[PDB]
């Protein structure tokens, strides 16, 4: 069994201050605290006060392609934004990417720190990370190949493997 970290985000407590962005960019800057730039923050707060939307979004993984279609939610009266909840370093927007180069950015919960900086600088208490243990993870391969064959053809698969 391995261990997983749940970043609890209380959007019902966040007040839109964007201090998380500040302190995060500040720490993840080189050298430490030599600068601050919200565009380099692993956490970015989706903010629109007119819509009563205050949602801290953390950085997830990198995708080299955009979705074929983009999701745009409406929940509990709030008309949220296109790709509003996505954590990805996706090339459809500047989010979670270096503002200069374009490089992706990922949150690592401040690897090597006692307490995540975004949480300590949240005096209102809207961010709390937790830890728990879950049981860690050949026929599936064969069935998957038999699935790909029946969809794209055997010659196509055999040619794709060798390229």
């Amino acid at each position: 069994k391995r261990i997983v970290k749940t970043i609890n985000i209380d959007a019902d407590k966040c007040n839109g201050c964007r201090a998380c962005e500040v302190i995060c960019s500040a720490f993840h800057a080189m050298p430490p605290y030599s600068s601050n730039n919200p565009a380099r923050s692993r956490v970015r707060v989706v903010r629109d006060p007119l819509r009563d939307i205050y949602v801290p979004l953390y950085a997830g993984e990198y995708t080299e392609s955009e979705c074929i279609g983009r999701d745009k939610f409406i929940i509990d009266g709030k008309e949220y934004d296109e790709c509003g909840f996505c954590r990805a370093s996706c090339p459809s927007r500047d989010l979670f990417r270096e503002p200069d180069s374009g490089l992706p950015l990922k949150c690592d919960l401040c690897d090597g720190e006692p307490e995540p900086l975004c949480v300590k600088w949240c005096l209102v208490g809207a961010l709390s990370v937790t830890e728990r243990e879950v049981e860690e993870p050949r026929t599936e391969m064969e069935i998957g190949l038999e699935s790909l064959i029946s969809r794209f053809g055997a010659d196509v698969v055999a040619d794709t493997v060798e390229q």
Binding site: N15, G16, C17, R18, A19, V22, P49, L50, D52, Y54, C122, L123, V124
Partner: peptide
């Protein structure tokens, strides 16, 4: 009073969103 909100980088949230019926927030 919809929500108490802050200025940049502050936890005091002195501001508030106001939504009256029939009016823009």
């Amino acid at each position: 009073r919809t929500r108490l909100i802050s200025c940049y980088n502050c936890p005091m949230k002195c501001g508030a969103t106001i939504s009256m019926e029939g009016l823009p927030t």
